[PDB]
Design a protein around this nucleic acid. Structure first.
Ligand SMILES: [Zn+2]
Length: 66
DNA sequence: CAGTGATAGAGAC
DNA sequence: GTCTCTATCACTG
């Protein structure tokens, strides 16, 4: 809305992924995509980035409760 | 309105 | 038949 285009300089320094449902941050201030943030923070150890992909699978949606 | 942390499901071999 | 990774939800300021 405020921006005329979604484009931007934001790039995942861990997997170069320029597309993601949400941008995460690290106590270093370096930008990270949602996957690296979730995987890197949970794993804490390097893992073949060859897993990353330029396509994101859309999952279903369901309220946690109620 | 946006972002985070936590939990669970699905896919491929 | 089993394992792993990733996304989405709800809540708060
Ligand atoms: Zn990334």
């Amino acid at each position: 809305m405020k921006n005329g285009e979604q484009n931007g300089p934001t790039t995942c320094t861990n997997c170069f992924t320029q597309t993601t449902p949400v941008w995460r941050r690290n106590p270093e201030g370096q930008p990270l995509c949602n996957a690296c943030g979730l995987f890197l923070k949970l794993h804490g150890v390097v893992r073949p980035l060859s897993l990353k992909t330029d396509v994101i699978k859309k999952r279903n949606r369901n309220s946690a409760n109620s």
